[PDB]
Coordinates of C-alpha atoms in Angstrom, one line a residue:
X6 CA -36.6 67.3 -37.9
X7 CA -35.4 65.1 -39.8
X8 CA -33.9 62.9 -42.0
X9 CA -30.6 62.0 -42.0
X10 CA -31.3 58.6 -43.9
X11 CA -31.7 59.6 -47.0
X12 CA -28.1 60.8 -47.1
X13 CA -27.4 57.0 -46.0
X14 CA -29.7 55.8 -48.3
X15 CA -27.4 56.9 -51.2
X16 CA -24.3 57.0 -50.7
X17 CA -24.6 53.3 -49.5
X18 CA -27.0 52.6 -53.0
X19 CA -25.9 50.2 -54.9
X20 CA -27.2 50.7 -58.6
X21 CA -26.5 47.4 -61.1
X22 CA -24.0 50.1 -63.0
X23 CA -22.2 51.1 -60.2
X24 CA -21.9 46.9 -59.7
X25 CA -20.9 46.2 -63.2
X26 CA -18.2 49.4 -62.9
X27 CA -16.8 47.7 -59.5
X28 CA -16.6 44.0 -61.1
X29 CA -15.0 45.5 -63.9
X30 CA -12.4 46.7 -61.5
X31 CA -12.4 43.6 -59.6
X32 CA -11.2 41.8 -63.0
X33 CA -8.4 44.4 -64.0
X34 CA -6.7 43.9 -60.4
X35 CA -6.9 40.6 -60.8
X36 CA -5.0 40.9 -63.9
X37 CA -2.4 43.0 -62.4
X38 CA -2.3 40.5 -58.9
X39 CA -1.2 37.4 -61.7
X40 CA 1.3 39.7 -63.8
X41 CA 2.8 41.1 -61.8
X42 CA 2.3 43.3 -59.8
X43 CA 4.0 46.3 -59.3
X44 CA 1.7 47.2 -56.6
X45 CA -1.4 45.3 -57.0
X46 CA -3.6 45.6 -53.5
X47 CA -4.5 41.7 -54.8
X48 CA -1.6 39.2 -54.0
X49 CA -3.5 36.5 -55.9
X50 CA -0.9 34.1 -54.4
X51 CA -0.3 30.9 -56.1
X52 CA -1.2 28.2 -53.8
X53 CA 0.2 25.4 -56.4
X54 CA -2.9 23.4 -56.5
X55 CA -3.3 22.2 -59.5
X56 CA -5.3 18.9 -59.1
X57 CA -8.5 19.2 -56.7
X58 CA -10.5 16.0 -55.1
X59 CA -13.0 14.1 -57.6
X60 CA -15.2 11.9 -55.7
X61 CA -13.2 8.5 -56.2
X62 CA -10.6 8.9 -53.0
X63 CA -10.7 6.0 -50.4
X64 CA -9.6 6.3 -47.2
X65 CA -8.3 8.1 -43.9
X66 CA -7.1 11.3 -44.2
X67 CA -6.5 14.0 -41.3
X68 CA -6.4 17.8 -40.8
X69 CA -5.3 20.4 -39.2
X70 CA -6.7 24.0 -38.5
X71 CA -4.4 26.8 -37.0
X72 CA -6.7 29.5 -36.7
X73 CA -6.6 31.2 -34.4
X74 CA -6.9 30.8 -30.5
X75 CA -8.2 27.8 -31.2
X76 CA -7.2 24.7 -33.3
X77 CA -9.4 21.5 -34.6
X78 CA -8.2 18.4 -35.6
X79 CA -10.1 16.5 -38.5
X80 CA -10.3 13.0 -39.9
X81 CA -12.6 11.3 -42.3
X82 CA -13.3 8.3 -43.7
X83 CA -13.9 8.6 -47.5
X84 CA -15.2 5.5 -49.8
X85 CA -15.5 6.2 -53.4
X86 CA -17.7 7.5 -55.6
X87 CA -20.6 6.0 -54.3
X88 CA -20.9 6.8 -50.3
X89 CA -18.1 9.1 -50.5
X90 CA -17.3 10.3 -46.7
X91 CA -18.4 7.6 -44.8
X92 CA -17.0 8.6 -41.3
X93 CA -15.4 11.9 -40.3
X94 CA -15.3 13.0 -36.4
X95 CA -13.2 16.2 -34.9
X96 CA -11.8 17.8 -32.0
X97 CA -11.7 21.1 -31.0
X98 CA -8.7 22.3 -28.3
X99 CA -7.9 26.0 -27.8
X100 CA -4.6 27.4 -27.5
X101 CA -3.2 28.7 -23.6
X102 CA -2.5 31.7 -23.7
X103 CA 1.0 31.2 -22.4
X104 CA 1.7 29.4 -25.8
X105 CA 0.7 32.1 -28.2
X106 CA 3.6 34.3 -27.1
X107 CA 6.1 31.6 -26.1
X108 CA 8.8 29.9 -28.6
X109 CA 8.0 27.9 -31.4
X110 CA 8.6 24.7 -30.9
X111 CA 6.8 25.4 -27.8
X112 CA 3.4 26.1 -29.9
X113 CA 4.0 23.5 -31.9
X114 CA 4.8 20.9 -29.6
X115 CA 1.4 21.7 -28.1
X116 CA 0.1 21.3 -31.4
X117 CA 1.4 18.2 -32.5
X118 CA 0.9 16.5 -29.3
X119 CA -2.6 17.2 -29.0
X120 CA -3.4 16.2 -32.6
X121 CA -1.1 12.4 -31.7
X122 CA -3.6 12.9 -28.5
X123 CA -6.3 12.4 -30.9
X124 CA -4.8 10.3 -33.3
X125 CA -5.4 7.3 -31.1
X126 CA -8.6 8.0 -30.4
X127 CA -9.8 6.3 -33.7
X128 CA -12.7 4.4 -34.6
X129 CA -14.4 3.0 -37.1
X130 CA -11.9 4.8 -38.9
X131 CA -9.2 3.4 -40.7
X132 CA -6.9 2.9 -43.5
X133 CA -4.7 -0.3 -45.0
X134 CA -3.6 -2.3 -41.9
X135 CA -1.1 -0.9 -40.7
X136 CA 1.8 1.3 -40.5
X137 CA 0.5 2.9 -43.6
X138 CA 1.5 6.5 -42.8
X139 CA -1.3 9.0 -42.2
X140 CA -1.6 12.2 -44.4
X141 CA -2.8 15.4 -43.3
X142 CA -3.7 18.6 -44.8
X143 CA -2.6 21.9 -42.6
X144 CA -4.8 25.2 -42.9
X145 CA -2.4 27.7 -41.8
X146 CA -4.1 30.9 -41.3
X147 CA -1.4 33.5 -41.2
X148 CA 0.6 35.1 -44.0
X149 CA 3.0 33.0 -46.2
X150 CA 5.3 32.6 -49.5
X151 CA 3.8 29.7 -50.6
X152 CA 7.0 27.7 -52.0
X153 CA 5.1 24.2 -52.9
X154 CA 1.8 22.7 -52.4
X155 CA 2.9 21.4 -49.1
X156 CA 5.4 24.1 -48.0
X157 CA 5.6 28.0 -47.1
X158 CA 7.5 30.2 -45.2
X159 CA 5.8 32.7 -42.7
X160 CA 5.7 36.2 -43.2
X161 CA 4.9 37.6 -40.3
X162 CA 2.7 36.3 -37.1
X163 CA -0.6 37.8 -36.7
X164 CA -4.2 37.5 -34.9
X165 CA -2.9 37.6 -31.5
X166 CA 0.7 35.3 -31.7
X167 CA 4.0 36.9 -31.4
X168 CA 6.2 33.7 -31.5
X169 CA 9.7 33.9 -31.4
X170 CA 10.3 31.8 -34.2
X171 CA 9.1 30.3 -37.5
X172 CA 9.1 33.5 -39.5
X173 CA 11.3 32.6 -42.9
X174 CA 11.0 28.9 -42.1
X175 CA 8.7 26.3 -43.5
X176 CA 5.7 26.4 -40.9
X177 CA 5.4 22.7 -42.7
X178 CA 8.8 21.8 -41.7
X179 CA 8.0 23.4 -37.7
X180 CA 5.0 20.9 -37.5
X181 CA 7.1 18.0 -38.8
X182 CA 9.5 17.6 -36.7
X183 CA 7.3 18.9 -33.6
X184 CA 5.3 15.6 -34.6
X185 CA 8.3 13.3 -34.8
X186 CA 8.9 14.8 -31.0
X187 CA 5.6 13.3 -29.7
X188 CA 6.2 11.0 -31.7
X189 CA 3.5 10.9 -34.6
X190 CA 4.3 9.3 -38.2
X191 CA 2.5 11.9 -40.5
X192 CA 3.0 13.5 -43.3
X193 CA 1.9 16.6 -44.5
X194 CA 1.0 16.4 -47.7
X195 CA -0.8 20.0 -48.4
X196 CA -0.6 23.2 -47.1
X197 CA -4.0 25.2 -47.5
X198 CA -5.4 28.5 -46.6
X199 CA -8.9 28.4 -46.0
X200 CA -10.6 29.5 -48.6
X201 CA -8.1 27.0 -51.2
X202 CA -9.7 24.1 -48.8
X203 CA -13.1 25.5 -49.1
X204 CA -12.9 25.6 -53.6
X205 CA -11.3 21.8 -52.8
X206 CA -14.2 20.7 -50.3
X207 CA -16.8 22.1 -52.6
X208 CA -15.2 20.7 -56.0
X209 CA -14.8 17.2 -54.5
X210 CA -18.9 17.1 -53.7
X211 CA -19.2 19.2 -57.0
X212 CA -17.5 19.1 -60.3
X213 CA -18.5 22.4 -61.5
X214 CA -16.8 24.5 -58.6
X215 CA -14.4 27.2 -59.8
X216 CA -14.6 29.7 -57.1
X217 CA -15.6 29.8 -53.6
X218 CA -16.6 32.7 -51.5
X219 CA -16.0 33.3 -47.5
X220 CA -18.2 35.5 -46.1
X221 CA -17.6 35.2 -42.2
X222 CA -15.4 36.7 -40.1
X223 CA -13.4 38.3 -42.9
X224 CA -13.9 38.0 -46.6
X225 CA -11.8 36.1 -48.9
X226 CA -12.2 34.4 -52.5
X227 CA -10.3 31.5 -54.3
X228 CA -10.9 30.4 -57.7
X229 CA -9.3 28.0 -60.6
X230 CA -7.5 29.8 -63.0
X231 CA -5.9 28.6 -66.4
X232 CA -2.3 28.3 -66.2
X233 CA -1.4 29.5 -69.5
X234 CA -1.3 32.6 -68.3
X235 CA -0.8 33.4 -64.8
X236 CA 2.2 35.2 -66.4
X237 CA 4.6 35.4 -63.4
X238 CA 4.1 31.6 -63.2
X239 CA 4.1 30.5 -67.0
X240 CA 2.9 30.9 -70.0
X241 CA 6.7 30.5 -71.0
X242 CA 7.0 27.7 -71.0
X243 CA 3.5 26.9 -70.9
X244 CA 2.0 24.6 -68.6
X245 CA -1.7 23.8 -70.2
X246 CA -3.4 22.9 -66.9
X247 CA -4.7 25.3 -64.0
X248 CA -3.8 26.5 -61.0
X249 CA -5.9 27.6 -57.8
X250 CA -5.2 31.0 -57.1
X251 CA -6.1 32.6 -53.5
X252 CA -7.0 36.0 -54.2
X253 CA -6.9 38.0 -50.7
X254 CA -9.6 40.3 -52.2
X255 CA -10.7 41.6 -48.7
X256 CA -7.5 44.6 -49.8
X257 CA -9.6 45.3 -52.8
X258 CA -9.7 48.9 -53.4
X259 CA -11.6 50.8 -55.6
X260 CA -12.5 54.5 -56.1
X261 CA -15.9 53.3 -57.1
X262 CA -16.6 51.5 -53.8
X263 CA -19.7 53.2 -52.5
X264 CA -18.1 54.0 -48.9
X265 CA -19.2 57.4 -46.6
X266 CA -18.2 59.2 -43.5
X267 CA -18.9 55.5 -41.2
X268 CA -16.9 53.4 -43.4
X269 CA -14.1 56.2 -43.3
X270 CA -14.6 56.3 -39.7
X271 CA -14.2 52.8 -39.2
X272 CA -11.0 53.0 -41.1
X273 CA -9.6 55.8 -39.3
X274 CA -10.2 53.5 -36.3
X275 CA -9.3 50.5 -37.2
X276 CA -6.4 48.3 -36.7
X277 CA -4.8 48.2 -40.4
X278 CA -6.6 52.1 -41.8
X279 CA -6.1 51.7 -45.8
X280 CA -5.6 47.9 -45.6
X281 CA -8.8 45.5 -46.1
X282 CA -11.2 47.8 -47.6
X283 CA -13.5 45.7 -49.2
X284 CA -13.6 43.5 -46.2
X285 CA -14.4 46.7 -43.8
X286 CA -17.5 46.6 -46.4
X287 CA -18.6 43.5 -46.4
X288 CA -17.8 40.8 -44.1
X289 CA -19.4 40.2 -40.8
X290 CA -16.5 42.0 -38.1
X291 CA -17.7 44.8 -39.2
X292 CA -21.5 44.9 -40.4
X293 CA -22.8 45.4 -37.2
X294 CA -20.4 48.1 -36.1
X295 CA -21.3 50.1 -39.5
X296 CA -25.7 49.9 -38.2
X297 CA -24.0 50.9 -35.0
X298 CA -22.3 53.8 -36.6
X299 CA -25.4 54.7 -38.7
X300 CA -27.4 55.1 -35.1
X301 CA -24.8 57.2 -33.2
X302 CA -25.6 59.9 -35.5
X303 CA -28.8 59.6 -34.9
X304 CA -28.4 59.2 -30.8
X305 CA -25.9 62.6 -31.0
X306 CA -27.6 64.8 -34.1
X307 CA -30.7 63.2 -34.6
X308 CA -32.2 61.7 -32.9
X309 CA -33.8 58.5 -32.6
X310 CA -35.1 57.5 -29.0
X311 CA -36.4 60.4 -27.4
X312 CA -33.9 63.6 -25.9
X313 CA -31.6 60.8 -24.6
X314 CA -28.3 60.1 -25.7
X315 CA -28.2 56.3 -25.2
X316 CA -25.8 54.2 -23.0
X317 CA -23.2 52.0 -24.1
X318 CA -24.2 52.7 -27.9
X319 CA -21.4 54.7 -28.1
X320 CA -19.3 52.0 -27.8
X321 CA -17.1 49.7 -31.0
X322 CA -17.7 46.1 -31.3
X323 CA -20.9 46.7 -28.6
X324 CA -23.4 45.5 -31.9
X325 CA -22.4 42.3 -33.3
X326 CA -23.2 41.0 -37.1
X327 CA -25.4 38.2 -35.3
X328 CA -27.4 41.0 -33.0
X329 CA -27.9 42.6 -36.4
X330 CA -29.2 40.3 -37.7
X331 CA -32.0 38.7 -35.3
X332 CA -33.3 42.7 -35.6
X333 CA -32.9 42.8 -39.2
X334 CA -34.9 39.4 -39.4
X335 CA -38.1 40.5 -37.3
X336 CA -41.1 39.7 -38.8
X337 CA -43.6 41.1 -35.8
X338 CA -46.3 43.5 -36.5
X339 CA -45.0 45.3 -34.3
X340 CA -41.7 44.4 -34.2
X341 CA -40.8 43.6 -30.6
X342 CA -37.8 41.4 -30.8
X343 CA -36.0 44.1 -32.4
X344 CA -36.9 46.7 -30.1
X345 CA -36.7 43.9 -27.3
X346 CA -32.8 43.4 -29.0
X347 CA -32.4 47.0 -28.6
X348 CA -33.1 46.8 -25.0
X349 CA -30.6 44.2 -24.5
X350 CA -27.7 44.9 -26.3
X351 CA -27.7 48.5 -25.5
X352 CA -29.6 48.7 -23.6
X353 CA -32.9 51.5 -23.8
X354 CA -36.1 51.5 -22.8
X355 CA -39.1 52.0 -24.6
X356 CA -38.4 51.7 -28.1
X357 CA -41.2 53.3 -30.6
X358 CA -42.2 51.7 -33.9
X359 CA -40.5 55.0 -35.6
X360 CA -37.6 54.1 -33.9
X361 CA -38.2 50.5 -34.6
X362 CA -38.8 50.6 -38.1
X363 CA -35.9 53.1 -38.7
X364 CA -34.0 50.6 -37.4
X365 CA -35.4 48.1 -39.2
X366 CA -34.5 50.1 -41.9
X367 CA -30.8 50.5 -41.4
X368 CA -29.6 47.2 -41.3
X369 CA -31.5 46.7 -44.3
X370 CA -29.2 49.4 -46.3
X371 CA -25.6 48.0 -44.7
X372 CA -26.8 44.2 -45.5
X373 CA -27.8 45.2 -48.6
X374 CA -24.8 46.9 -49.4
X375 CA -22.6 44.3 -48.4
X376 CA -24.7 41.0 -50.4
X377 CA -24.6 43.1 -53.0
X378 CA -21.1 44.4 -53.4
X379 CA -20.2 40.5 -53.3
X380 CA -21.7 39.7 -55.8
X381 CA -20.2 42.5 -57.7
X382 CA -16.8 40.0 -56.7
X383 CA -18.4 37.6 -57.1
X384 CA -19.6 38.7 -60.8
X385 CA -15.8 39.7 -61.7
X386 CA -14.2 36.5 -61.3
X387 CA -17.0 34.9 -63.5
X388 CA -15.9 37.7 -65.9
X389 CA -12.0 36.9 -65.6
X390 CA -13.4 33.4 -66.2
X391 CA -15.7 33.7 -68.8
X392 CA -18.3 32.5 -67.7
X393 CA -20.2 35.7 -67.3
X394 CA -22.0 35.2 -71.1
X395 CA -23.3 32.8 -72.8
X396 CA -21.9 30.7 -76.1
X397 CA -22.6 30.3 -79.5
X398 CA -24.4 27.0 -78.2
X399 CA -24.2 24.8 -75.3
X400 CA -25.7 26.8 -72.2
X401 CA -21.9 26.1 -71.5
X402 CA -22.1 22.7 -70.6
X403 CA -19.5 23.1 -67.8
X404 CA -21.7 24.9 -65.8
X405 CA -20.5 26.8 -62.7
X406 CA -21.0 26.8 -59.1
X407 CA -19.5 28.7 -56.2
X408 CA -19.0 27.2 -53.4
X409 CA -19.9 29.6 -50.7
X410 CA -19.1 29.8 -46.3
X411 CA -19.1 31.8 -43.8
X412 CA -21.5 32.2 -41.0
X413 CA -22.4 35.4 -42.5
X414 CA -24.1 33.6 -46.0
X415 CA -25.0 30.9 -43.7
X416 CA -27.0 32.6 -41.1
X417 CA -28.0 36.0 -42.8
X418 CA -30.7 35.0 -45.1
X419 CA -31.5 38.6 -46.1
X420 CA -28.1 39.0 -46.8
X421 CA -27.8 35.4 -48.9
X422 CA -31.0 35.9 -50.8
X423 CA -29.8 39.6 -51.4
X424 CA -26.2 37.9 -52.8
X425 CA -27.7 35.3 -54.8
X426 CA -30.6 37.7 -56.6
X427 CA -27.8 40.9 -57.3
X428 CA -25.6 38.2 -59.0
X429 CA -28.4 37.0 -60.8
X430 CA -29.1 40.8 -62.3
X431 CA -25.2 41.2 -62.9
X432 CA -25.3 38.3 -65.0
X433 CA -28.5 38.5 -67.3
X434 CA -31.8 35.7 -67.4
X435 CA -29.4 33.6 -69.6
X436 CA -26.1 33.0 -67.8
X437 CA -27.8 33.3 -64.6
X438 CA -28.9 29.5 -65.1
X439 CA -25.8 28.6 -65.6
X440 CA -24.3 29.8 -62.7
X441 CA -25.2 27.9 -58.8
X442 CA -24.2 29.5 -55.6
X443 CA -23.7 26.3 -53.3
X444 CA -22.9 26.4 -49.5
X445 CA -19.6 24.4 -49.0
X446 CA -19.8 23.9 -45.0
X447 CA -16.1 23.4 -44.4
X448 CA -13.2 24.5 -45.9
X449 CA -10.8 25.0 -43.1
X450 CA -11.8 22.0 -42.2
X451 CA -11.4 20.4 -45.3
X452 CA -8.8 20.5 -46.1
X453 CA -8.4 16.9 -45.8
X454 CA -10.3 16.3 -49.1
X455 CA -7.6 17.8 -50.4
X456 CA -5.3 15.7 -48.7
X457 CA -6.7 12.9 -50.4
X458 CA -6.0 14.4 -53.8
X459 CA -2.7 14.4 -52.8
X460 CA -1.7 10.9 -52.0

């Protein structure tokens, strides 16, 4: 006895068909998301950008983050074409608790006077002397009807808020007149979700951006799409331009999504079961608690260390995406920073180099599983944009990049390198030179680019 990893070691496999079957599916929700829907799993909200930064912006410009517990505050100098953000500095302040489950004007009084806290703070920084009115650019990261490019009404509070208030009313329109209360002259001139301001930060450093790719906490995509049609937005009358879409593919759903008994189990468990499958797969909240699954099984009908049915390894959340990967990144003979991991995090004595190297060799089937099925997304918005195959002639000179984040392609360089090479088998030894993956550092952040493109 035994081998229980070969059952793992398939029905998490990951064959280039299966990829192509899944991008293929990736591209006909997206269809139905734009049309739409009836009940499309892929909102591919509108978020009425339709010009993004170019390089030539001058001047201050601020931002705002609502995240989660915490909030920053951005500003950044910007100077043209030729030494393009010459200053940028940030804050970081996190949200009392009392606040998160008070009244709104209460939250966003809080808000707003922190950020007019910082706003005389400056530097060093600065725009035409003087009563010039600042801009900023708000990432709002909760649920919205998008109703302009600097306006939405909430849907419904999330992530740890239940405000009494906001909810059907501009959240623009709630930090407006919080400022004015504090009293700060700024307008609001965009209102992004993060992955909009990632596509914006990475085209304004980039021409050739048409996508951009989260793969952090959660997973989510943006990409430019041509205008004529998103059908439930044009093409009668036709507009001729494009339009950013943000595509909340983290509900993706698919029949052909390689999930098993874990990945179920996860979702049986979870917080929102049938909701976010794709995300459940791939993103980084949950990597670590899939190898932690994959163990169990093999610490209750296995087993793997001994007779013993380890400690708190029968615990969620216990194994973290970044424990994962320090063991998956071990390069020891002998591997003793992943068993000394397992020791920690766990922990468990005496750790064998059967028991290491098994280990070793589960995080490198739910990584692998994950960087690849994102580039199986990946792969279908190139498809939707056609920019999966080559022309008649021209290498397509607009070449494309996707601007990537996340601390999960940032930090996981099995899991980036694994990303980068599967996309480059989706799409063949032609297009793949055509198409860059490009870290875009800060899109939540930035946000303010945006805000520049904007007046």
């Amino acid at each position: 006895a035994a081998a229980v990893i070969e059952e793992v070691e398939q029905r998490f496999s990951t064959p280039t068909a299966l990829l192509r079957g899944i991008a293929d599916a990736m591209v006909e929700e997206m269809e139905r998301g734009l049309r739409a829907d009836p009940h499309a799993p892929l909102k591919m909200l509108i978020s009425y950008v339709d010009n993004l930064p170019t390089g030539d912006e001058h001047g201050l410009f601020y931002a705002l983050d609502l995240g989660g517990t915490n909030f920053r505050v951005i500003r950044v100098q910007l100077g043209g074409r030729e030494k393009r953000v010459v200053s940028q500095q940030y804050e970081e302040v996190a949200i009392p608790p009392h606040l998160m489950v008070g009244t709104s004007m209460e939250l966003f009084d809080f808000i707003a006077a922190e950020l007019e806290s910082f706003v005389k703070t400056e530097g060093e920084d600065f725009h035409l002397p003087e009563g010039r009115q600042r801009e900023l650019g708000f990432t709002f990261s909760f649920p919205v009807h998008q109703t302009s490019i600097s306006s939405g009404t909430l849907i419904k509070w999330t992530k740890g808020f239940s405000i009494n208030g906001t909810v059907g009313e501009d959240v623009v329109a709630e930090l407006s007149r919080a400022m004015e209360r504090q009293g700060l002259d700024m307008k609001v001139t965009a209102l992004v979700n993060d992955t909009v301001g990632t596509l914006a930060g990475g085209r304004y450093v980039d021409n050739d951006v048409a996508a951009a790719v989260i793969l952090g906490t959660g997973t989510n995509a943006a990409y430019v799409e041509h205008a004529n049609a998103i059908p439930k937005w044009t093409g009668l009358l036709p507009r001729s331009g494009n339009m950013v879409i943000n595509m909340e593919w983290g509900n993706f759903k698919s029949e052909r999504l390689p999930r098993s008994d874990y990945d179920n189990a996860l979702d049986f468990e979870s917080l929102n079961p049938g909701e976010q499958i794709y995300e459940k797969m791939i993103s980084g909240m949950y990597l670590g608690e899939i190898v932690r699954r994959i163990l169990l099984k093999l610490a209750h009908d296995a087993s793997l260390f001994g007779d013993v049915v380890p400690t708190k390894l029968e615990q969620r959340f216990i194994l973290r995406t970044p424990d994962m990967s320090a063991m998956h990144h071990d390069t020891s003979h002998d591997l003793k920073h992943l068993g000394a991991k397992l020791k920690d995090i766990l922990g468990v004595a005496d750790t064998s180099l059967e028991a290491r190297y098994i280990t070793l060799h589960v995080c490198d089937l739910v990584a692998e599983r994950g960087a690849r099925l994102a580039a199986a997304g990946i792969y279908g918005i190139l498809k939707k944009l056609g920019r999966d195959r080559v022309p008649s002639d021209g290498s397509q000179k607009q070449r494309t990049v996707i601007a990537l984040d996340g601390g999960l392609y940032e930090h996981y360089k099995k899991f980036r390198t694994c990303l980068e090479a599967t996309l480059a088998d989706l799409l063949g030894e032609e297009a793949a030179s055509s198409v860059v993956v490009k870290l875009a550092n800060d899109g939540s952040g930035i946000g303010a680019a945006l805000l520049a493109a904007s007046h």
